[PDB]
Amino acid sequence: GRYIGPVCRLCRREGVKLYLKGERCYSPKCAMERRPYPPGQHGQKRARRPSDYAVRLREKQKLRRIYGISERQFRNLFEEASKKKGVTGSVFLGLLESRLDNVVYRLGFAVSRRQARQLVRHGHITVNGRRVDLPSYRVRPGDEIAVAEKSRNLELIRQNLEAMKGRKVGPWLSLDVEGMKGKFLRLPDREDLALPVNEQLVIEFYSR
């Protein structure tokens, strides 16, 4: 997807299992288990107290590097979520989570988001029966996210959905397998996601 580099060296910088890879991250790796310290020749010496700033910075990185998104595109969302009405923090989360590239991951078509990004850019994903090849596209509520009719018997997709048979998908998403079809029921609320981010902090970093 974007960033396109070593992802698990980011798991190892945030000191958190980030799952930027899905499958193997559940193995005995994700980088974290076995070697859970920072990347670089130095990331194993006694860590100095993070400045007030680093703390709020590293926390944003933790959120942005999850959804795999340019800072230019992250901040654009945050500012919008800011101007918007409601707890500007959770509206932000609502917005990231409303992204098509991510909703495809949530409905387990891809096993990662990097994989879900490409699944869209290569046109295997449809919204409301029309095709959408933009990771950015904002899913609204009531929309149905299908797997493209002529993409259905594809290898990467088959394994990915026989694995989805018998698994639960978020309380704000519908999903029927065999039909390769989801449904965006509602914008998730703050306690619906289990993100390892303070998020309150992310707001503070964008007013430094």
Partner RNA sequence: UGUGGACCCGCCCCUUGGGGUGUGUCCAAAGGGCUUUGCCCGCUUCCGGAUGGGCCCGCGUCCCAUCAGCUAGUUGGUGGGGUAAUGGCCCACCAAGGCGACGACGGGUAGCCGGUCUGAGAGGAUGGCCGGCCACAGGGGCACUGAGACACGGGCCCCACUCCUACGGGAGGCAGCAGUUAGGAAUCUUCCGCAAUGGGCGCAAGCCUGACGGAGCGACGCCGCUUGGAGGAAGAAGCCCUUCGGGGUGUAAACUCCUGAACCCGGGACGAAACCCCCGACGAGGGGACUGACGGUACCGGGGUAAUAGCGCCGGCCAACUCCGUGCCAGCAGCCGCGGUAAUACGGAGGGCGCGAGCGUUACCCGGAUUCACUGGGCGUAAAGGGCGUGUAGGCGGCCUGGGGCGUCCCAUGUGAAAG
Partner RNA sequence: AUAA
Partner RNA sequence: CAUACC
Residues making up the binding site for Zn(2+): 8, 11, 25, 30
Q: Of the two residues 48 and 191, which places its CB atom closer to RNA in the complex? A: 48
- Segment contacting Zn ion (CB under 5 A): 4-12, 33-41, 87-95, 116-124? 4-12
- Segment contacting Zn ion (CB under 5 A): 5-13, 58-66, 83-91, 176-184? 5-13
112 binds, among Zn ion, RNA, none (CB under 5 to 8 A by kind): RNA
Among 29, 152, 181, 190, interactor with RNA by CB under 7 A: 29
Distance set, CA 93 to CA 6, 21, 43, 81 (Å) = 25, 20, 30, 9
Residue 106 in the binding site for RNA (CB under 7 A) = no
Number of residues forming the site for RNA (CB under 7 A) = 64
Handedness of CA 120, 125, 127, 131 (dihedral sign): positive
- Segment contacting RNA (CB under 7 A): 52-60, 139-147, 171-179, 194-202? 52-60
As given in the structure block, the two tokens for residue 160 are: 């990915």
- Footprint on residues 107-166 left by RNA (CB under 7 A): 110-112, 114-115, 117-119, 121-124, 131, 134-136, 150-151, 154-156
List residues binding RNA (CB under 7 A): 1-9, 12-13, 20-25, 27, 29, 31, 34-35, 38-45, 48, 50-51, 53-54, 57-58, 61, 70-73, 76, 110-112, 114-115, 117-119, 121-124, 131, 134-136, 150-151, 154-156
